Enzyme design. Structure first.
Site, PDB file in Angstrom:
ATOM      1  N   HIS A 121       0.866  -1.168   0.000  1.00 21.38           N
ATOM      2  CA  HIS A 121       0.000   0.000   0.000  1.00 21.38           C
ATOM      3  C   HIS A 121       0.909   1.226   0.000  1.00 21.38           C
ATOM      4  CE1 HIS A 121      -2.671   2.870   2.130  1.00 21.38           C
ATOM      5  NE2 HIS A 121      -3.733   2.012   1.965  1.00 21.38           N
ATOM      6  N   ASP A 198       3.497  -3.943   8.028  1.00 22.75           N
ATOM      7  CA  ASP A 198       2.229  -3.184   7.911  1.00 22.75           C
ATOM      8  C   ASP A 198       1.112  -4.210   8.195  1.00 22.75           C
ATOM      9  OD1 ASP A 198      -0.134  -2.120   6.996  1.00 22.75           O
ATOM     10  OD2 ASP A 198       0.560  -1.619   4.956  1.00 22.75           O
ATOM     11  N   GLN A 201      -4.182  -4.780   7.528  1.00 25.36           N
ATOM     12  CA  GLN A 201      -5.227  -5.709   7.041  1.00 25.36           C
ATOM     13  C   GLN A 201      -5.113  -7.096   7.727  1.00 25.36           C
ATOM     14  OE1 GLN A 201      -8.344  -7.457   4.996  1.00 25.36           O
ATOM     15  NE2 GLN A 201      -7.786  -5.293   4.927  1.00 25.36           N
ATOM     16  N   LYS A 224     -10.164  -0.474  11.084  1.00 21.28           N
ATOM     17  CA  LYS A 224     -10.392  -1.725  10.344  1.00 21.28           C
ATOM     18  C   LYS A 224     -10.804  -2.913  11.240  1.00 21.28           C
ATOM     19  CE  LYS A 224      -7.568  -2.477   6.724  1.00 21.28           C
ATOM     20  NZ  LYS A 224      -7.532  -2.667   5.205  1.00 21.28           N
ATOM     21  N   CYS A 361      -5.135   2.287  -3.209  1.00 17.85           N
ATOM     22  CA  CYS A 361      -3.882   2.834  -2.676  1.00 17.85           C
ATOM     23  C   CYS A 361      -2.689   1.888  -2.987  1.00 17.85           C
ATOM     24  CB  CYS A 361      -3.895   3.050  -1.135  1.00 17.85           C
ATOM     25  SG  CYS A 361      -5.359   3.958  -0.503  1.00 17.85           S
TER      26      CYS A 361
HETATM   27  C1  LIG Z   1      -2.576  -3.075   3.937  1.00 17.69           C
HETATM   28  C2  LIG Z   1      -2.895  -1.685   4.291  1.00 17.69           C
HETATM   29  N1  LIG Z   1      -1.905  -0.904   4.798  1.00 17.69           N
HETATM   30  C3  LIG Z   1      -2.103   0.390   5.236  1.00 17.69           C
HETATM   31  C4  LIG Z   1      -3.322   1.003   5.144  1.00 17.69           C
HETATM   32  C5  LIG Z   1      -3.453   2.422   5.588  1.00 17.69           C
HETATM   33  O1  LIG Z   1      -4.278   2.271   6.841  1.00 17.69           O
HETATM   34  P1  LIG Z   1      -5.018   3.678   7.424  1.00 17.69           P
HETATM   35  O2  LIG Z   1      -3.856   4.579   7.798  1.00 17.69           O
HETATM   36  O3  LIG Z   1      -5.903   3.157   8.549  1.00 17.69           O
HETATM   37  O4  LIG Z   1      -5.714   4.290   6.203  1.00 17.69           O
HETATM   38  C6  LIG Z   1      -4.411   0.254   4.621  1.00 17.69           C
HETATM   39  C7  LIG Z   1      -5.636   0.948   4.431  1.00 17.69           C
HETATM   40  N2  LIG Z   1      -6.200   0.627   3.050  1.00 17.69           N
HETATM   41  C8  LIG Z   1      -7.577   1.154   2.802  1.00 17.69           C
HETATM   42  C9  LIG Z   1      -8.314   0.148   1.862  1.00 17.69           C
HETATM   43  O5  LIG Z   1      -7.763  -0.925   1.576  1.00 17.69           O
HETATM   44  O6  LIG Z   1      -9.425   0.444   1.381  1.00 17.69           O
HETATM   45  C10 LIG Z   1      -8.346   1.424   4.254  1.00 17.69           C
HETATM   46  S1  LIG Z   1      -7.125   0.807   5.458  1.00 17.69           S
HETATM   47  C11 LIG Z   1      -4.163  -1.106   4.242  1.00 17.69           C
HETATM   48  O7  LIG Z   1      -5.179  -1.829   3.801  1.00 17.69           O
END
Ligand SMILES: Cc1ncc(COP(=O)(O)O)c([C@H]2N[C@@H](C(=O)O)CS2)c1O
Ligand SMILES: Cc1ncc(COP(=O)(O)O)c([C@H]2N[C@@H](C(=O)O)CS2)c1O
Lengths: 413, 413
Positions: A121, A198, A201, A224, A361
């Site tokens: 991401h 990270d 998820q 999440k 993203c």
């Molecule tokens: C694997 C992964 N890494 C980092 C983030 C960023 O998390 P956030 O800072 O809570 O937006 C996310 C974010 N991605 C967004 C999505 O997948 O729609 C919402 S949580 C992620 O899925």
């Protein structure tokens, strides 16, 4: 694990959109909250809100005990050794930027490498791009296998003795891949590097044990995992946090402040500048109590079931491509052959179904997949097989609808 | 403005502590929330929570409209020209650090000055200490007059044509001084500097008009103005934000992401990395609707009344010193001659009264005041003269109690 009883606890699921029961399949963008979490915020603001620490009055002490109590719930939840290793932040993205600012920029020099992967991401790409630019170090990418997994041989090849940081997703928010983090941490460490994981998820959906993973840092988001928005955690091994400088400065994170110089508090408060996210962190503790009472292993087993059922039912559709490996977390990202995924998402919302469309993203990943955008259905502990039937039936109806618009647009022309 | 009707809206006020009605006089540490704000968070999580922006589904669109709608409420509330100038942060402290990271560290060089004042809170001292250390610039302090106000002649003297940044509190969380920000911004600008205003303690309590103040940046916290914790605003003139780089990096704040380089979104989203504080920002919008319906000028007039009543009743106490000027915001910081302020606060909490004791995150100021700590009673729109009578009666009883402990401890020895 009874999904009717779990669903009863989430008020937002019980409504219609566009005249159809809501079918929410977008928990990878954010999760919905049970009454136990919302009523925790309500009780905080109805009964014991006050600023925390240096408690001199009864509501202050109650708020403080709530906030530091939630810190302990988090430590136990990810199996950290100490509360000093649990920092409250506003989210995974801030937690990863703190590591890039306070660890990477202090420890990289020309010839050092940061190694990431093509499926990351943006939150686990751009802080490193910036930190390597600031220090003159080099950024490298571990390649993917053709099913969107990572091979440990590729990891071994990419990570060298000049590597100082490997940063990698626990679970991909697009592919659903569960990466081999524990074995990647061994390769990082064998090379003299730290690993930054990270966990945005993975943490909502599967048990996290930072002692077993042996990750140096781990970042997660409350929104999440059934918790309030605006709150996250950075875990880091205590010996590394002790040697990192704060990423921001102010009240509450100092010990002494002179005109020109200041000294910092011990961990974890060294990294928590200003009045903290008091209600949100206490509601993240209630989310954890909620998930633990159901069982993270029960939640993973339910999602394994939903994912195996979804992939099978997607393969029954003609003209649909699903990205990533067969073994996976509880989400499916896909495209219909002849329809833009935004139009897919628009039509599914007309039938009450909420999914996401876009690059999620992960632009370098979309490039690797040779697509400009994808649609994504993502699951959690309140979703059911019947909701997946509704999705696959609507995708079928969507395909027919667009092939009929087209067929009859060219009997016009 | 009817204080009975206002109090009815704040559930937390209606309880006892230690067998006495609560008398909460600590709103400068944090404010309490009316049902309109708490029920706004509840409706968000009960009905329309979803991640925001790129809206493809009905709850997403509702959440997005809520979040960006609150952005507009904030812009109107401080009279900013554009939503592009309103950045949501986690609080005043983060907003000031963003200016120190993205503005000061990009624009200071050896021989440049940052000028602050001796009464600043740590959040408006330490980011500058760090930014001047990083760039080799110099930090200077504007002196105070003996009643804890600032003279514009001292400002003129301290600010020079090498000054690039003046940073100063709108209202002191300790002295209650309202600083002459509009005239200080003229002196900064006449010298080629920008002014950064810490509005954490002014925004809840008095009307803010950033066009009239002509401040370059202005920082505030929701938790002090009837809103949720964990949320703040950084306002900055659009022409300065446009030329500042982001303070953190990730999803949502990019336009294009390649393997090594990325470009940013336009303002304000350039400064909002990752999933934002969605519920908190919407509840800060409801707080603003709440305060505007009462009238900020009505709230200031009520607090003027309480402060004039408090200072008069404090002067009726023997053995008590109050710090700062006669003309002031709605708080009183003080010490009892022979009693440590922590013991003062402890005893007042036994009578249901909540005040704060300590340095209030202003150590250089305590040094200037020649004390190591102080006690502080601070007021808001739900406090009354009767609560101030209870405070002054308890301070009297506290003095007698400690003089009797002492008198009878030395008939023992
Ligand atoms: C694997 C992964 N890494 C980092 C983030 C960023 O998390 P956030 O800072 O809570 O937006 C996310 C974010 N991605 C967004 C999505 O997948 O729609 C919402 S949580 C992620 O899925
Ligand atoms: C004038 C002034 N400036 C900055 C801050 C820091 O605000 P925060 O980031 O919301 O903690 C404060 C904080 N001071 C704390 C207090 O006075 O008790 C709680 S709000 C302040 O009063």
């Amino acid at each position: 694990m009874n999904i009717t009883d779990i669903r009863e606890q989430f008020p937002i699921l019980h409504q219609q959109v566009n005249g159809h029961d809501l079918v929410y399949l977008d928990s990878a963008a954010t999760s919905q909250k049970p009454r136990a979490v919302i009523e925790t915020l309500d009780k905080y603001y109805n009964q014991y809100n006050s600023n925390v620490h240096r408690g001199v009055h009864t509501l202050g002490t109650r708020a403080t005990d709530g906030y530091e109590g939630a810190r302990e719930k988090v430590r136990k939840f990810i199996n950290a050794k100490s509360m000093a290793e649990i920092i409250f932040t506003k989210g995974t993205t801030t937690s990863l930027n703190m590591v890039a600012l306070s660890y990477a920029r202090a420890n990289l020099k020309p010839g050092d490498e940061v190694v990431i992967t093509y499926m990351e991401h943006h939150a686990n790409i751009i802080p490193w791009q910036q930190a390597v630019k600031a220090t003159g170090a080099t950024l490298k990418y571990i390649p993917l296998q053709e099913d969107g997994t990572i091979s440990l041989e590729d990891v071994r090849e990419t990570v060298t003795s000049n590597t100082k940081i490997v940063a990698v997703s626990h679970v991909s928010n697009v592919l659903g891949t569960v990466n081999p983090i524990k074995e990647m941490a061994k390769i990082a460490h064998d090379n003299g590097a730290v690993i930054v994981v990270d966990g945005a998820q993975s943490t909502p959906h599967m048990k996290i044990d930072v002692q077993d993973l042996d990750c140096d840092f781990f970042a997660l988001s409350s929104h999440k995992m059934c918790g309030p928005t605006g709150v996250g955690v950075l875990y880091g091994k205590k010996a590394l946090l002790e040697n990192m400088e704060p990423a921001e400065f102010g009240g509450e994170m100092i010990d002494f402040v002179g005109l020109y110089e200041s000294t910092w508090k011990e961990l974890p408060w060294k990294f928590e500048a200003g009045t903290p996210i008091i209600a949100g962190a206490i509601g993240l503790g209630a989310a954890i109590d909620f998930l633990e009472e159901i069982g993270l292993d029960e939640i993973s087993r339910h999602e394994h079931k939903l994912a195996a059922y979804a992939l099978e039912r997607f393969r029954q559709l003609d003209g649909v491509t699903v990205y990533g490996p067969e073994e996976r977390a509880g989400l499916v990202t896909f495209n219909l052959d002849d329809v833009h995924p935004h139009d897919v998402a628009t039509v599914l919302d007309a039938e009450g179904i909420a999914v996401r469309a876009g690059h999620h993203c992960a632009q370098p990943l979309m490039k690797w997949l040779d697509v400009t955008a994808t649609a994504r259905a993502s699951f959690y502990l309140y979703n059911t097989e019947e909701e997946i039937d509704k999705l696959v039936e609507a995708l079928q109806k969507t395909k027919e609808y667009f092939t009929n618009v087209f067929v009859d647009l060219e009997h016009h022309h």
